[PDB]
Amino acid sequence: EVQLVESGGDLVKPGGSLKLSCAASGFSFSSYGMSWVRQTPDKRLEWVATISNGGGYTYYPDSVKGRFTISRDNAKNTLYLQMSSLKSEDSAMYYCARRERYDENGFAYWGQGTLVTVSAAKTTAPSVYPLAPVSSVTLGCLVKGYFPEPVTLTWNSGSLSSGVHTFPAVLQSDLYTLSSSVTVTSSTWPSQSITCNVAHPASSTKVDKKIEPR
Amino acid sequence: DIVMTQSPSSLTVTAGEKVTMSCTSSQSLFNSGKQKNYLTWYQQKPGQPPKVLIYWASTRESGVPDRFTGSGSGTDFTLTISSVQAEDLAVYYCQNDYSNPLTFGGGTKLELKRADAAPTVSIFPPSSEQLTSGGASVVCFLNNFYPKDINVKWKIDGSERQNGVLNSWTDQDSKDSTYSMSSTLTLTKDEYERHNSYTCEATHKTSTSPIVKSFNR
């Protein structure tokens, strides 16, 4: 399969540096131009850089010129983006993409992306709170004050997926809050346990929070 | 920079209908030597990266169903779906691939039409565990409603509170085409304790009267 895999995303302080890489497999890497494209938090797409198949020619929009450098190592099938003087504005999911031959160009076979968070806030574990109510009942789970993204949240270790809503995290005062609801029939809870399984990789936190009545 | 502007930002569609999306560049994307317009269309389905759909304005990539047709030249391009399917719900982006800086349009998001549905509202007082942090969050879930436009007011003892509210919305549910919203009201334990009545109310077009969920301590 032609495949591109981005790596290197992390939380970095403003003014800092970070090097991203993109491992290419399944095609002859030196025959193609390559690019980085980022998708910002509000879902806009921005071209970040392009490099010719040999590495001689590099192009950058003014927002990034002088701060980012794209380079490639054609013997090791790897593309790089060296970022320095990072700004809050550079927080985004970064993707590398192949520029197609036969003059098609464009951006193709995008990887799954790597997440870059540029911020002064430090890694903070979430506090997870059960939301119990004092045919169906809606229970919930509040995951408050974590940093950075992501957190993973499932109900009953994934067994419960119908009737579930997890709301996208929003940044309040440099900390994120996320919540999820699950609606089950009244015969289910409270006899059967409903547990909210939260994981925050950056602080190495895992919580299975049971939603009790009392 | 060539500015790419797409129209409309979002479009409600019924399945089986023809939909046309427009994309306008500020300068021509046509290359006279090569007799091609260098305009690419991308489709981004939720949770996944964009995929190239059509390039050189009208040539489809492999695997793209031919119900998609790209058209136009110069500065105005259209993407048409002859009969839109549920699997086509996505954001569609056009892109200037002609001159650097390479630029993207802002996207046209497709949403599926369904019958209006009123929200199921649920309110939750602060969990005791949270009370210990010195904080108190009251949560209201407004679930499974349609259309998406909705307004949420919090009242504490009948008076409106605008500060400390954090709302988050889901994208259209692929299982029933509905939307959901979460509204959280955070206060210090101190202020929470000196009030008795917490109200979350919503205005949505399924009702002349506000949907209200309240609890009294």
Short mmCIF file of all heavy atoms in Angstrom, two decimals, chain A residues 49-70:
data_model
loop_
_atom_site.label_atom_id
_atom_site.label_comp_id
_atom_site.label_asym_id
_atom_site.label_seq_id
_atom_site.Cartn_x
_atom_site.Cartn_y
_atom_site.Cartn_z
N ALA A 49 4.74 23.14 3.65
CA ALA A 49 5.98 23.18 2.89
C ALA A 49 5.92 22.12 1.79
O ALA A 49 5.10 21.19 1.94
CB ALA A 49 7.16 22.87 3.78
N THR A 50 6.69 22.34 0.68
CA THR A 50 6.91 21.32 -0.37
C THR A 50 8.42 21.23 -0.66
O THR A 50 9.17 22.20 -0.49
CB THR A 50 6.17 21.67 -1.69
OG1 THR A 50 4.79 21.73 -1.38
CG2 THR A 50 6.34 20.60 -2.79
N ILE A 51 8.89 20.03 -0.99
CA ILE A 51 10.25 19.77 -1.38
C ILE A 51 10.23 18.91 -2.66
O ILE A 51 9.35 18.05 -2.82
CB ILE A 51 10.99 19.10 -0.18
CG1 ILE A 51 12.49 18.97 -0.60
CG2 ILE A 51 10.36 17.76 0.25
CD1 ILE A 51 13.45 18.52 0.58
N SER A 52 11.14 19.21 -3.61
CA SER A 52 11.22 18.48 -4.84
C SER A 52 11.69 17.07 -4.56
O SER A 52 12.28 16.80 -3.51
CB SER A 52 12.18 19.21 -5.77
OG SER A 52 13.47 19.37 -5.16
N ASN A 53 11.59 16.17 -5.55
CA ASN A 53 11.98 14.80 -5.30
C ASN A 53 13.45 14.63 -4.96
O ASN A 53 13.80 13.75 -4.17
CB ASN A 53 11.57 13.97 -6.50
CG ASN A 53 12.25 14.26 -7.82
OD1 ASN A 53 13.13 15.09 -7.97
ND2 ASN A 53 11.76 13.60 -8.86
N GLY A 54 14.34 15.48 -5.49
CA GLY A 54 15.74 15.43 -5.15
C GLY A 54 16.11 16.21 -3.91
O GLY A 54 17.19 16.00 -3.33
N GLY A 55 15.24 17.09 -3.42
CA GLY A 55 15.62 17.88 -2.26
C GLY A 55 16.17 19.26 -2.60
O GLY A 55 16.41 20.08 -1.71
N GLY A 56 16.37 19.57 -3.88
CA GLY A 56 16.95 20.86 -4.23
C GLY A 56 16.04 22.06 -3.99
O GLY A 56 16.51 23.15 -3.64
N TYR A 57 14.74 21.92 -4.21
CA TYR A 57 13.83 23.05 -4.20
C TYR A 57 12.84 22.94 -3.06
O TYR A 57 12.22 21.87 -2.94
CB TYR A 57 13.04 23.14 -5.50
CG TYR A 57 13.97 23.42 -6.66
CD1 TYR A 57 14.31 22.40 -7.51
CD2 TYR A 57 14.50 24.70 -6.80
CE1 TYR A 57 15.22 22.66 -8.52
CE2 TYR A 57 15.40 24.97 -7.80
CZ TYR A 57 15.74 23.93 -8.64
OH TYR A 57 16.66 24.14 -9.63
N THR A 58 12.73 23.96 -2.20
CA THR A 58 11.78 23.93 -1.11
C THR A 58 10.96 25.20 -1.17
O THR A 58 11.48 26.27 -1.52
CB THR A 58 12.49 23.84 0.24
OG1 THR A 58 13.48 24.84 0.32
CG2 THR A 58 13.15 22.48 0.42
N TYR A 59 9.70 25.09 -0.81
CA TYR A 59 8.77 26.20 -0.88
C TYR A 59 8.01 26.21 0.43
O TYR A 59 7.80 25.16 1.06
CB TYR A 59 7.80 26.01 -2.04
CG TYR A 59 8.51 25.74 -3.37
CD1 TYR A 59 8.67 24.43 -3.78
CD2 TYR A 59 9.01 26.77 -4.13
CE1 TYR A 59 9.31 24.15 -4.95
CE2 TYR A 59 9.67 26.49 -5.31
CZ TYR A 59 9.81 25.19 -5.70
OH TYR A 59 10.41 24.90 -6.91
N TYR A 60 7.61 27.40 0.86
CA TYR A 60 6.99 27.63 2.14
C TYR A 60 6.09 28.86 2.03
O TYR A 60 6.40 29.76 1.23
CB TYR A 60 8.02 27.96 3.20
CG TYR A 60 9.17 26.98 3.33
CD1 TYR A 60 10.36 27.21 2.65
CD2 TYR A 60 9.01 25.88 4.17
CE1 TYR A 60 11.41 26.33 2.82
CE2 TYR A 60 10.05 25.01 4.33
CZ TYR A 60 11.24 25.25 3.66
OH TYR A 60 12.30 24.41 3.91
N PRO A 61 4.96 28.94 2.71
CA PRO A 61 4.12 30.12 2.71
C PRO A 61 4.87 31.10 3.63
O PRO A 61 5.68 30.68 4.46
CB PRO A 61 2.81 29.65 3.27
CG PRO A 61 3.22 28.56 4.21
CD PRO A 61 4.38 27.88 3.50
N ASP A 62 4.60 32.40 3.57
CA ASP A 62 5.24 33.38 4.44
C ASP A 62 5.06 33.14 5.94
O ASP A 62 5.93 33.52 6.70
CB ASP A 62 4.71 34.78 4.16
CG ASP A 62 4.96 35.35 2.76
OD1 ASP A 62 5.95 34.97 2.13
OD2 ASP A 62 4.17 36.20 2.33
N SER A 63 3.94 32.55 6.40
CA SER A 63 3.71 32.32 7.83
C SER A 63 4.78 31.49 8.51
O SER A 63 5.11 31.63 9.70
CB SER A 63 2.40 31.61 8.02
OG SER A 63 2.31 30.44 7.19
N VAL A 64 5.37 30.61 7.73
CA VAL A 64 6.33 29.64 8.22
C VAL A 64 7.75 29.89 7.71
O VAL A 64 8.71 29.32 8.26
CB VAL A 64 5.61 28.37 7.77
CG1 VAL A 64 6.55 27.32 7.29
CG2 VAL A 64 4.71 27.95 8.91
N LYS A 65 7.93 30.70 6.64
CA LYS A 65 9.23 30.87 6.03
C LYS A 65 10.23 31.44 7.02
O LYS A 65 9.96 32.30 7.86
CB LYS A 65 9.13 31.79 4.83
CG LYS A 65 10.28 31.69 3.83
CD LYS A 65 9.95 32.66 2.70
CE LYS A 65 11.17 32.92 1.79
NZ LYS A 65 10.95 33.98 0.80
N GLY A 66 11.42 30.86 7.01
CA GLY A 66 12.43 31.32 7.93
C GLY A 66 12.35 30.54 9.22
O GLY A 66 13.38 30.43 9.89
N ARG A 67 11.20 29.98 9.61
CA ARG A 67 11.09 29.23 10.87
C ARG A 67 11.08 27.72 10.68
O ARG A 67 11.55 26.98 11.54
CB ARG A 67 9.81 29.58 11.63
CG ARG A 67 9.66 31.07 11.96
CD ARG A 67 8.43 31.37 12.81
NE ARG A 67 7.20 31.02 12.14
CZ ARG A 67 6.34 30.16 12.66
NH1 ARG A 67 6.64 29.56 13.80
NH2 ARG A 67 5.21 29.87 12.02
N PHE A 68 10.48 27.23 9.60
CA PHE A 68 10.39 25.80 9.34
C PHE A 68 11.32 25.43 8.20
O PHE A 68 11.52 26.24 7.29
CB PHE A 68 8.97 25.38 8.94
CG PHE A 68 7.86 25.50 10.00
CD1 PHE A 68 8.04 26.15 11.21
CD2 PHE A 68 6.63 24.99 9.71
CE1 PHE A 68 7.00 26.29 12.11
CE2 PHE A 68 5.60 25.12 10.60
CZ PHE A 68 5.78 25.77 11.79
N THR A 69 11.88 24.24 8.22
CA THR A 69 12.70 23.74 7.15
C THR A 69 12.25 22.34 6.78
O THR A 69 12.20 21.45 7.64
CB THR A 69 14.15 23.69 7.56
OG1 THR A 69 14.56 25.00 7.91
CG2 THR A 69 15.01 23.21 6.41
N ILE A 70 11.93 22.09 5.52
CA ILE A 70 11.61 20.73 5.11
C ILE A 70 12.88 20.14 4.47
O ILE A 70 13.59 20.83 3.74
CB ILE A 70 10.37 20.76 4.13
CG1 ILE A 70 9.90 19.35 3.81
CG2 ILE A 70 10.73 21.44 2.83
CD1 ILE A 70 8.62 19.44 2.91
#
